[PDB]
Structures are given as structure tokens and as C-alpha cells.
Amino acid sequence: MSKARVYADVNVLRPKEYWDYEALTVQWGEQDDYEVVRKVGRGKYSEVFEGINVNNNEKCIIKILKPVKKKKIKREIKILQNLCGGPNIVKLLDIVRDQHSKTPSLIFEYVNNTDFKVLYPTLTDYDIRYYIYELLKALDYCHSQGIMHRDVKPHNVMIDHELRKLRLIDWGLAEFYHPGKEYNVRVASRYFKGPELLVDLQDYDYSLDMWSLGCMFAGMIFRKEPFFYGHDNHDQLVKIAKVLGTDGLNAYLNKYRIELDPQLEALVGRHSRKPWLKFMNADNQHLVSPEAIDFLDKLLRYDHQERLTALEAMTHPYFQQVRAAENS
Numbered sequence: 001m002s003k004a005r006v007y008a009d010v011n012v013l014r015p016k017e018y019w020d021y022e023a024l025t026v027q028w029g030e031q032d033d034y035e036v037v038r039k040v041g042r043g044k045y046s047e048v049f050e051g052i053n054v055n056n057n058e059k060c061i062i063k064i065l066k067p068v069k070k071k072k073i074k075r076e077i078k079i080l081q082n083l084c085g086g087p088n089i090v091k092l093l094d095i096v097r098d099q100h101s102k103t104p105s106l107i108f109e110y111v112n113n114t115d116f117k118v119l120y121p122t123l124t125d126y127d128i129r130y131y132i133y134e135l136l137k138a139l140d141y142c143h144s145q146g147i148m149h150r151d152v153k154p155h156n157v158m159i160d161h162e163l164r165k166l167r168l169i170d171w172g173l174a175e176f177y178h179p180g181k182e183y184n185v186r187v188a189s190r191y192f193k194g195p196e197l198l199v200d201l202q203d204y205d206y207s208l209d210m211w212s213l214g215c216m217f218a219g220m221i222f223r224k225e226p227f228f229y230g231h232d233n234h235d236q237l238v239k240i241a242k243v244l245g246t247d248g249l250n251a252y253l254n255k256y257r258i259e260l261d262p263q264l265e266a267l268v269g270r271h272s273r274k275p276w277l278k279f280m281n282a283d284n285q286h287l288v289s290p291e292a293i294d295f296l297d298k299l300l301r302y303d304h305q306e307r308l309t310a311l312e313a314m315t316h317p318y319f320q321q322v323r324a325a326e327n328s
């Protein structure tokens with residue numbers, strides 16, 4: 001059995017109105033209020049367009065959803081509403097649907113994002129600490145509100161580099177945390193899936209997002225996209241084991257009485273732990289200081305219970321200049 005070490009009782013103490021999302025009655029806005037200006041992305045669940053609010057002429061993001069279950073859509077909407085106004089949490093502006101096709105569209109605030117594939121390589125040491133700190137704010141906030149994002153990755157972190165503004169988006173996989181509840185491990189994107197998901201540990205918690213954040217952090221300071229590059233869920237665990245080592249994995253599995261599928265256990269094999277500095281090179285030298293390594297080490301732990309919480313991460317000395325700057 002496993003439970004979160006913080007914010008475990010948030011949804012226990014709050015009224016059903018807060019977490020009983022299936023009771024939500026969607027209030028639709030007016031589709032004609034928003035017009036498409038250009039497509040900016042696509043995905044398995046939606047088509048994304050930069051749009052504009054014809055009323056106030058303000059930019060927005062229109063996500064036209066592909067067929068989705070009433071249950072799933074209400075969950076994303078309820079969570080967005082609960083987190084409204086939180087630090088760096090994307091704002092849901094409106095919800096509309098096309099009467100004839102019944103196609104729903106979610107309207108979000110616009111963020112002039114620079115593809116991480118091009119942005120990250122230009123980030124300085126300070127930029128990295130700054131943006132990761134900002135992302136942490138959003139995570140501690142949602143976790144403090146009894147919610148797990150479950151899909152933290154560069155594609156879901158919008159950044160207007162010019163304005164140094166960051167927003168954590170796409171809460172379609174997020175879930176409310178309930179002590180002891182068994183969740184579906186089929187969440188997050190492969191390169192950012194934590195060990196718990198890869199070994200089928202279902203009673204995971206907020207800590208899952210901290211592994212994901214760590215993967216992003218490792219990618220930034222080591223200049224690797226992504227850091228753990230696996231081809232399928234089994235290979236993903238292998239790539240991880242080849243870094244943290246199998247000793248740590250076995251200890252993890254024995255602590256939670258988990259048995260790897262024979263094939264998987266066969267693929268992982270046996271590996272030694274590799275020091276983080278073995279990934280340093282002339283390209284990521286100006287970014288891999290001892291503080292960065294110490295912080296990364298405390299995030300990428302097999303045991304989700306050992307990882308820093310978002311609040312702890314924000315206080316790590318690695319971020320001291322970012323904190324000092326803010327309190328000005």
C-alpha cells in the first residue's frame with residue numbers, strides 16, 4: 001500500500017462538489033465568439049488553433065476535441081475550474097460545441113510559445129532554474145489542491161520566452177488524488193513515465209509528476225531530448241535501469257511487493273548505477289553544476305516516496321537566486 005506524503009487528505013476534507021466531477025453540469029458559451037486564425041498543433045485528442053475572441057479582439061487557443069466520453073471531458077473541465085487563478089495554471093476561458101456534430105471545443109488563454117525543441121537549446125543556466133522554478137509553482141499548487149497532472153512534459157509547458165511567462169497546460173489526463181485509490185497506469189507520455197507506471201504500481205500519487213519534471217530537468221541541463229529515450233514502455237524502463245542501476249530497481253520492487261513481467265525482467269537485465277557526471281560534455285558544461293546534479297538526483301528516484309515534493313524542490317539551494325530575485 002502507498003499513499004502521498006503530503007496533501008493526502010485534500011479531497012477527504014473537501015465537499016463532494018469539489019471532486020465529484022461527474023456531477024458537473026457543463027455550461028456552454030457561444031461558438032461564434034471565437035474564430036480560428038491559424039492551426040498551431042494537433043494530437044490524438046484534438047486540433048489546436050490560435051484564435052481570437054471577436055468580442056474583445058483578444059487572442060486565445062481553440063482546442064477542437066475529437067470524439068470523447070462525457071466522463072473524461074467533465075473531468076478535465078472540473079479540474080481546470082478548480083485550479084483557476086493558480087500560479088502558472090493555464091486559464092480555461094470558455095467551452096463551446098457545434099450543435100449538428102456535437103463537437104466540443106475548449107477555449108484557453110493564448111501563450112506565444114516557442115517550440116521546446118528550439119527554445120531549450122538557447123536557455124542559459126539562469127533561464128533553466130527560473131523556468132523550472134515557475135513550473136514547480138504550478139505543480140505544488142495543483143498537488144495542494146488534490147490534483148495530479150499526470151502528463152508533465154515540454155509539449156504541455158507553454159513558454160513565451162520574450163515575456164518569461166510559463167503556463168502548465170493540457171489537463172486532460174489529470175486526476176483527483178484519493179488516499180489508496182488505484183489509478184490507470186496508462187498516463188503521461190513515454191519518455192516522462194515514472195517507474196511506478198512502468199511496473200504497474202497503481203496506487204501512485206503526486207510524486208509521479210516529480211519524476212516527469214526530473215526528466216525534463218535532466219533533458220535541459222544535459223542538453224538531451226529526451227533524456228530517457230525508449231521505444232516502448234518496456235524499453236523505457238530499460239533505459240532508466242541502465243542509468244539508475246538494477247540494484248535500485250530490485251529494492252523498489254521488493255518494497256512494494258511487485259513482480260515484473262518475465263519478458264520485461266529479461267529485457268532489463270542487470271546494470272550498474274552510472275554517475276550523473278558521466279553525461280557531462282563540452283555542450284552542457286556551463287549547465288551541470290553540483291547543485292543541479294544534487295537536485296536532479298533527489299527527483300529521479302525509483303521510489304516515488306523518496307522523491308522531493310514540489311514544495312521541497314522549490315526550496316533547494318539550486319533555486320536560491322531565483323527565490324532571492326522574486327522576493328524583491
Ligand SMILES: N#Cc1cnn2c(Nc3ccccc3)nc(NCc3ccc(Cl)cc3)nc12
Nearest residue numbers: 040041048061108109110111112113115155169
Ligand atoms: N491550453 C493551452 C495553450 C495555450 N497556448 N498554447 C499554444 N500556443 C502556441 C502558440 C503559437 C505557436 C505554438 C503554440 N499551443 C498549444 N498547443 C499547440 C502546441 C504547439 C507546439 C508545441 Cl511544442 C506545443 C503545443 N496549446 C496552448
